[PDB]
Write an enzyme that holds these catalytic residues in place. Structure first.
Site: not given
Ligand code: MG
Ligand code: MG
Lengths: 15, 431, 427
Positions: C41, C158, C167, C208, C245, C286, C313, C338, C366, C389
């Site tokens: 945003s 995460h 990740e 995820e 990642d 990543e 990314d 993305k 995603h 992914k």
């Molecule tokens: Mg990433």
């Protein structure tokens, strides 16, 4: 058919 | 509307396990597609899904056999038939299978085709599934948007905590539309994550998209839900009521109910009923699912006398969406509500019959998901098209749950003034 | 194929937050429907989604304003136009919004209509979306089934463990079809649950659909994944490779990388990563450095880029202006795509093409907040991107994409080859 239409999540509105 | 092609395929469910998807194609280009949710493959009481049991694929959970039934004998029996005749289509499959519990072809095969057929037929009639369902039901133009009971906290066999009750749910009875109910649910769900985080508890989600934190008692679960409801700015009892699933079979031993997370005390059927009764005085719990073991009909008779006038008593394991069992329950004053799992019965026609039996007896029907779901949202159309009045389709996360809420949004938007959201009065015992 | 109606609505994403869904209806009844996944945003580099900020609805995350943009200014601009002209449709929206980052209507509003329009046009043309996408892409009939990198273990920001890396992912490179790749993923996924339960660890899932158990280090994380692959009857490095990642910005401080589970200079962190790739068959990394560390990334690319896929990314944020500068400066060799980060199908096709032309790989991605929408499946196939992914093998927000890939491969067969290992840059 699209998955949305076939699954019934969207509908036709025009003939 | 003649059937021209039926396709079965093995897709993946929300738990990563195979399930059956079917497409029904009609003359004119109309297509319906649906998938079966996860079910039981063994047991004596419910319709059985067919599983492959091949250890070399999906740890024995393949559905290639059920998919083969769709593509082969089911397809062959239905090509050329009229999709609009739902009862006829369902009867062909029922007779061809030849077993009461659909255990030859699998209830997963039969249901996927049953639903896909109904969607295809709706399309041929130029109407959405929920409208077609109302017509099939003999109640055309009669709709409601169901009051959701939304998973929020898990325990018992569905967690690794000291909560004995399998799940607690919130019901946004104070909402004036299903869209508002969904928003209320979302806000409470998010406030609960914050509340649990601050306690140092885990906020990763379970199969139904809700939380299973390391709470130390049934009372603690109710307390944390109340706190999230307050945080969200809603009033417990007015805006939001509570529903629970005891899954009481999980603590039934030697004719008694032993609750580990309650100091391992061993309640009689009557004592457990009163344990529940006290909970309903302490919190606005208005619905209790499987509050005793399915075999404990003497106990259920007592529970229904004690609680049934003011509390919705929902049979899940009690009835397994079985009209033969439901009928006897009604005769014996056993519960006052039934969970409807269409894959436990296996066809749309039979599902309509179960919902009708409940309504005729003044019982409420609660349309249910399964633990293993898909992107499919047929239960939303089913709940609206039969004006069932309630739905149990998960917490407010995971698209296996939220796909159903989104479909309810689309349906309410379409129907508008024709689909009232009736709020608390849908619940048995609530006026 | 004339647009006769455009409808936007507020629906709920996989994290329980609002997002935009759009329908585009054409003369003759053809309809397409799509939804935007979650995005940003705020920020000055990517296309921005529009959020309401009304504290009394959805904790300020409503999308009524973006939905109103769909139903009002966007609808009236597009009604009457030819849905088959994707670039034309997207140009109208981009020009009308008038900002550089789609912040007037929101990238959520614009993308939802962009995708729903493409589906409507495909329906008018009597073809599936993937086929229409190939035609839009100027590569008619060119397809592949993408090699999935599947979330398996989460760490860093995460998770709530002592894993620094954000990740870890598995890639079923040894599979011969995507349907087989999906089964392999499911089997490893279920075996990992078994391994974690045996260790007394939590097996509830994150956004995820993978696990975030209380592992003590990056080493322990890779150990349990190795164990699960073996338990499932597959050989690491042969049947299955590893992708990760780092989200290296999350430990970037005063030009240095401070892990707090293992203070590296840029060069030192690259060799730390190099050490991991010798020990394990990690073939894709990543965001191995902070997006601002371009001198660091040039070094990492020189050291690792010949033998490892280096996926931007946060580095690129699906921005062709950034990707162009990266390409010329020798920065990374792969880019996460993305579509909501750029905001339209046309611009997404341009990002994939720019990547491919420079020998970079495009991994179709995603977002954390998803829906049942499976457009990225059709997008990956129709552009022959080669990699996807789209999550672990649970949650229908993830699994719906795998199901759509199954449906597409069922239709296309040998017309959409699963190319396996060779899709990965450096392999
Ligand atoms: Mg990433
Ligand atoms: Mg139950």
């Amino acid at each position: 058919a699209s998955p949305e239409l076939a699954s019934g999540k969207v509908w036709i509105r025009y003939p | 509307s003649k059937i021209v092609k039926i396709i079965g395929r093995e897709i993946i469910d929300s738990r990563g396990n195979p399930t059956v998807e079917a497409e029904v194609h009609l003359e004119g280009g109309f297509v319906g597609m649906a998938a079966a949710p996860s079910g039981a493959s063994t047991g004596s009481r419910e319709a059985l899904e067919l599983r492959d049991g091949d250890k070399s694929r999906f740890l024995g959970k393949g559905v290639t056999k059920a998919v083969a039934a769709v593509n082969g004998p089911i397809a062959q029996a239905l090509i050329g038939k009229d999709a609009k005749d739902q009862a006829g289509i369902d009867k062909i499959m029922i007779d061809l299978d030849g077993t009461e519990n659909k255990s030859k072809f699998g209830a997963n095969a039969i249901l996927a085709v049953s639903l896909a057929n109904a969607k295809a037929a709706a399309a041929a009639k130029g109407m959405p599934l929920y409208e077609h369902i109302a017509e099939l039901n003999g109640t055309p133009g009669k709709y409601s948007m169901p009051v959701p009971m939304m998973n929020i906290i898990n325990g018992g066999e569905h967690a690794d905590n000291n909560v004995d009750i399998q799940e607690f749910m919130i019901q946004p009875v104070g909402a004036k539309t299903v869209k508002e109910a969904i928003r209320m649910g979302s806000e409470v769900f998010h406030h609960l994550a914050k509340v649990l985080k601050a306690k140092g508890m885990n906020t990763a989600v379970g199969d139904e998209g809700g939380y299973a934190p390391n709470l130390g008692s049934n009372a603690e679960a109710l307390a944390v839900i109340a706190e999230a409801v307050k945080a969200a700015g809603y009033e417990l009892g007015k805006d939001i009521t509570l529903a629970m699933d005891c899954a009481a079979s999980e603590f039934y031993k030697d004719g008694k109910y032993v609750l580990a997370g309650e100091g391992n005390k061993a309640f009689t059927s009557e004592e457990f009923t009163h344990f529940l009764e006290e909970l309903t005085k302490q919190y606005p719990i208005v619905s209790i699912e499987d509050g005793l073991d399915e075999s404990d009909w003497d106990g259920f008779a007592y529970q229904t006398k004690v609680l049934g006038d003011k509390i919705q008593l929902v049979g899940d394991d009690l009835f397994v969406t079985n009209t033969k069992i439901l009928k006897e329950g009604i005769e014996k004053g056993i519960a006052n509500s039934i969970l409807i799992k269409f894959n436990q019965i296996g066809s749309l026609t039979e599902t309509l019959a179960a919902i009708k039996m409940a309504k005729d007896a003044g019982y409420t029907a609660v349309i249910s998901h399964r633990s293993g779901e898909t992107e499919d949202a047929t239960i939303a159309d089913l709940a609206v098209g039969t004006a069932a009045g309630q739905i149990k389709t998960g917490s407010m996360s995971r698209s296996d749950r939220v796909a159903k809420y989104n479909q309810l949004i689309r349906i309410e938007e379409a129907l508008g003034e024709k689909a009232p959201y009736n709020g608390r009065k849908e619940i048995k015992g609530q006026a």
